[model samples]
Target: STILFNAYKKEVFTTNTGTKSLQKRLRSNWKIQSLKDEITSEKLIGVKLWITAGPREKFTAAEFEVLKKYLDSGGDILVMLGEGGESRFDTNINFLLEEYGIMVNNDAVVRNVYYKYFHPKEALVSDGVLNREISRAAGKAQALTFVYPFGATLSVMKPAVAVLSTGSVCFPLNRPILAFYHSKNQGFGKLAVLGSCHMFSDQYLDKEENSKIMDVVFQWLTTGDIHL
Candidate 1:
C-alpha cells in the first residue's frame, strides 16, 4: 500500500497483457493485485493508476460498481485489449468502459503493407494523435508512429477523444488503437484504452516508442500540475 508513485494492475488467472516496463516508463512503483476479493478504498487511496489488460473473467458486479465509484472519485485507469474480445475470453469490461463511451472490437487488426519487424500484424499509425487536442500541449505528433502488433480495434464513442489510430495500410482503415477519455466530471480523472499489448512488451516498447508518444502519454497521466 505504499502510495508515493505506484501503479496497480490486476492479474487473476488471466493472460496478463501489460508490461512492467510501465514502472520505468512512468518512473513509478508497480504492484499487481487480484480483484477476486473485492476492491476496497483501502487498496486504491493515493494510488496513481489502475490497469486492466486482457482480463478473462467477467468482473464481479460489485467490483464494477466499486471501480465506477473509484473513477468518479478521480482515480485514473488504463485498459488494454488484445486479439480476442468478449468472445474468446470471458472478459466483459465493457460493463465499465461503456459507461465512458469506449468499446473494443474483437477482430485482430491486420495490414497489407509495411510494418515494424516486417509483420503485417504490426500495423503502424502516424496521424491520429496529431489530430487530438493534447497535441496542443504535447506538440506536433507527426513523429509518433505506433505499431499495434496482433491487436484489436477500438471505438471511442462521443466525448471520448480518439488519441491513436491506424492508417489506410490497416484493415478497418483509420481504426483507433488508442484513445483518451476525460469524463464530464473533470475530477473523475482520466482513462486511456489501448488496443495493443505487445507495443509495451520489452521486445517492442523501444521500437517506435510510440514515437516517444508514450513519454507524452505517461506525462499526461501523471502530471497533475508539474508544469509552467
Candidate 2:
C-alpha cells in the first residue's frame, strides 16, 4: 500500500529531487513517504516497502531491532549502498543485512572495457542478470544491460538469492550485485539489496534498461509476482 523511504539515516536519495524519477514511477502503485523519525512499528503501519538508499550514518541497535521485527511481521525492505560500502557510506547497514546473509563489499565495481559510458565506475553491464527470472520479469531473455553507476558488489549466501552480478566485464568479475531474501512468514515479507544507490537515481534510471530493472525490483518487493 505504501513505500517508505527512510530519511532518518540521511539516505543518498529520497522522494525529493534526488530520486524524483523513481518516485514518479512508483507513485502509480504505492503511496510514497519519507521516514525522518526513528523506525517504529507505529511508523511502519501499512508500509509495503521500506527503503534506505546509501544511508550516511550509523544506526542504533534499537532501530535495527525494530527493522528486524518489521520484516518478520511481513514488511518488505530494500537496502541500497554505493561503492566502498559501509566505509564510504558511514553506515552499519550490513549489521542488519548480514542477518539475512547479505553483505556489501567495501570495494567498487569498474568496467574493464568501455563501451558507451565514459567513467569506469559508471559500469554499463551488458551481461549481468544472474537470475533468469529477472530477465523474464524485465520482458527479455537476453542479458539485461544496465548502468550501475558508482556501485559496489555484494556477497550473498544461502537463504539470500543473488539476482544480478557484476558480469565478466567488470572488475570483481561475476560477483553478485543484487540479492533477494524472502522471510518465512506466510505473508512473506521480501528484502532486496542493491549495490548502487545511484543506479536508480534520475540520472541513470532511464539509461539502458535500468528503468526496466528498477520496475522488476519494486514489483518483486511490493508484490508476490516474482516467484524467484
Candidate 3:
C-alpha cells in the first residue's frame, strides 16, 4: 500500500474540488497528504504515488529537493497546470522537472477556432486529441484555456516518450501530455503533465470518454502500462 500527496492550496476553488474528488475515487488503502504541511523523506519513502495540482512555488528549496529525491527514487507524479496568466511558474518548477527530461513553457495553451465557453467571458478550449482521433464528432470540449506562456513542451534531453498533445492548432503539436522515464538507480518513474486542469473536475469525471483517458493515465503512472 502507498500514500498519495496532493500538493494544492486551500484557497484554489477548482483545484481543491478536484483533489477532494481524487481522494474519494482512489483506493481506500492510500493516504492523501497536503504539501502545505511539513514534508519529510520518510513521508516520501512511505508513498509510491504523488499528485501535484495547482501552484507549489512556495515550497522551500529543501522541500523541493525532497520531491526531486523522491522522483529520483522512482516515484510517480501527475502534474495538472491551471488556466490563467498566473499559472506559469517555470522558475520554481524547472529545478525538479529538469531532472526528468521535461520542460514547461511560460505560455498558456489557447484554441481560437475549436474553443468552448464555460462563461460568456471565458471563451477558450483545448483540442483534446490524445494520440489518435477515435471520432471527430466526439471531441472533448476544453472549457478552460490552460495558461501557458508557451505550455509545457518535451525536449527529450534523456530517453523519454510523449503521450498527449494539445492538438495541431497549438504550438508544438503532439507535445507531451503524458510521459515516462526510467533510471537504473530510480527503477521506474512516470509523469503526466496536463495543460488544462478542468479535465479532473467533478463535472467531467463521469464523462465516459474522459474517464477512459483519465484511467489510462493512472494505469500508466501506477502500473507502467500505456494503453494508448
Candidate 4:
C-alpha cells in the first residue's frame, strides 16, 4: 500500500491525473494523500516511499514535523516544486537535508539559447545527451513550463553525492538529479532529488527517454539500486 502524496491544493485535478497516469504506466497502486490529512506513522508504515508533487504553501507546523521524522527515519521523498507557484516553504525540508549535507537555492533555473526554443520561456534538451537511463526515459516524458520563481541548488553538507547535473548552458549549475546518504544516524538510506518537475507530466509518459529517467529513479527508490 505505497502512498503517493500530492501536497498541492490548487492543482488537485491535474495532479490526480498525473498520479493516476504514472500508476497505470508503472503498474503500481499509489494512494493520494493530501497535506491536510492527519498522517500517522501507522498509516505511513505501508508507504515505503512517497512523492510530493507540490507541498502546500506555509506548510503546517505539525505536518512539517511528520515529514521531518519520515525523512530522518530513512523514508524516500521525491519532491517536485513548480516554477512560479506559491507553497515553496521548503526550509524545514531543507533543514533536514542540511542534516544530511544538502542545500537548495531560491533562484529559478532557466535555460540558455542552446537549451531554449521548445517554448518561448522554457528550455528543451534537443541534443539528447543526458545519462543513458535518463536519455532512454526521455522518450516517454514531456517537457512542461516551469514558471520561474526559484529553483533548487545543492551543496554537499556531509557525504552526499549528485548523480545528474544540468549543463552549463542552463542558468543553474549541475541541477542535482540524485543524492545519496551512505550512513546517517546509524541508518543507511538514499535520498534523490531532481530540480525539474516535468518528468512526471502525463504528456511525457509515452516518451521512452523520459520514461527511462523515471524508471531509473523508481528503481533506485524502491530497490536501492542507485545506478539504474
Top TM-score model: 2
lDDT by residue for model 3 (1-228), tens: 465655543323232455556556565646555555556788767677777665535556887777767776778777655443134443255556666676555444544444343432221224444444322224353322232222344444465556556555565454554455555556666666654455555645554355556655666677634444
Measured by TM-score, how close is model 1 to the native structure?
A: 0.80
Q: After superposition, how far is residue 10 of candidate 3 from its true place, in Å?
A: 6.4
Model 2 C-alpha lDDT per residue in residues 1-228, reported as the tens digit of each score = 888998878888877757888998888877998988788888899898899888999999999988888888888899999999999888889999998999999999998877888888998887888877777544464467889999999999988999899988888899999999985764587899999999999899878889889888988887747777
lDDT of 4 by residue, 1-228 (tens): 464564443432234555556666544445544444465655567666766654434445676667667766767666554443232543334555566666554545566663323542344433323344444333443432222213444555457666555444555644653455545663545466554455566655445355555666677676544452
Number of clashing residue pairs in every model?
Answer: 0, 0, 9, 25
Stretches of candidate 3 above 4 Å error? Answer: 8-16, 84-91, 114-116, 119-157, 169-173
Candidate 1: list runs displaced more than 4 Å.
Answer: 1-18, 28-37, 114-118, 130-133, 136-141, 224-228
Q: Which candidate is the best by lDDT?
A: 2
- In model 2, where do residues sit more than 4 Å from their true spots? 137-141
Residue 91, model 2, lDDT: 88
Q: lDDT of all predictions, in order shown?
A: 0.63, 0.87, 0.53, 0.52
What are the models' TM-scores? 0.80, 0.95, 0.70, 0.69
